[PDB]
Amino acid sequence: KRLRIGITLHPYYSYVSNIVGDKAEVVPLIPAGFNPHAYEPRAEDIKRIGTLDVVVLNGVGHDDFAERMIASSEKPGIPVIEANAKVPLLAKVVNPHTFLSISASITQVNTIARELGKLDPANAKAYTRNARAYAKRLRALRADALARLNKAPAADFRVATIHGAYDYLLREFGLEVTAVVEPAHGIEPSPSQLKKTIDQLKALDVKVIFSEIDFPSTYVETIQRESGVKLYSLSHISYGDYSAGKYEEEMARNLDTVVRAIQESG
């Protein structure tokens, strides 16, 4: 009767909780504290799918584990909400970190609310109303961060990141990522690859590097020393407890750090 909705990543817990409020139950597929990049399906977690009515998926490359878990469960035909159905992607591998964008988060929130409404019509109007209030808060969060930005960065403001998570985030400043240290999503560089990346940061005069707060890497100190590139850190919104407010709290901090990096470039 009261929908039981599965989620895969922390941002989706925040989206669904804000959409449904107390009208439905939000169930994480994997426990808090586990790195979703390294998570391997456990029997205990696959069992949980059998008690759900629907699973919300990133479905564009950040939760492949969830499709495998569903296939191995008691409900392989469980309804699935493809959150990114209406989201413009980039770019050669499609970047799956659409949740680290205010505009793409609003699109995903609206898609989730519409789809949950079709599954639970008695609550369709409430889900729509809640999604619109949540989208208003996300726009305000972005406006508040931009209220601290004086100028756009100079033409020479090149940016690098350790994890390939921030292309959508930086796109909201009209900025691009020159280089990503990890050769592929969540893959540590070899010593030869890291040396080549350091050489590239120097050759292209990269100004800043955004590292990971969530599951940090031990070679970042070497990059800073060897390249002279200013270091800032961002959240993939993937560490610790699930909470309705996690997404907005950590995105506000992400946007403030990007603004600070630009402010400190001049």
Residues within the annotated binding site for Mn(2+)? 37, 62, 97, 163, 185, 236
Q: Do 229 and 207 form a contact (C-beta atoms < 8 A)?
A: yes
For the record, the structure tokens of 154 come out as: 């100079």
Extract the annotated binding site for Fe(2+).
37, 62, 97, 163, 185, 236
Task: Check if the beta carbon of residue 99 is closer than 8 Å to that of residue 138.
Answer: no
Q: Tell me how far CA of residue 67 lies from CA of 36, 59, 81, 177, in angstroms.
A: 14, 8, 12, 30
Q: What is the C-alpha separation between 69 and 43, in angstroms, rounded?
A: 9
Residues with Cβ within 8 Å of residue 221, at least 6 apart in sequence: none
DSSP 8-state secondary structure symbol assigned to residue 189: P
Strand order in the sheet with 158-161: 179-180, 158-161, 206-212, 230-234
Residues 6+ positions from 58 with CB-CB distance below 8 Å: 8, 9, 12, 83, 84, 96, 98, 99
Tokens, residue 139: 């726009």
Per the annotation, binding residues are: 37, 62, 97, 163, 185, 236
Cα separation, 166 vs 152, in Å, equals 18
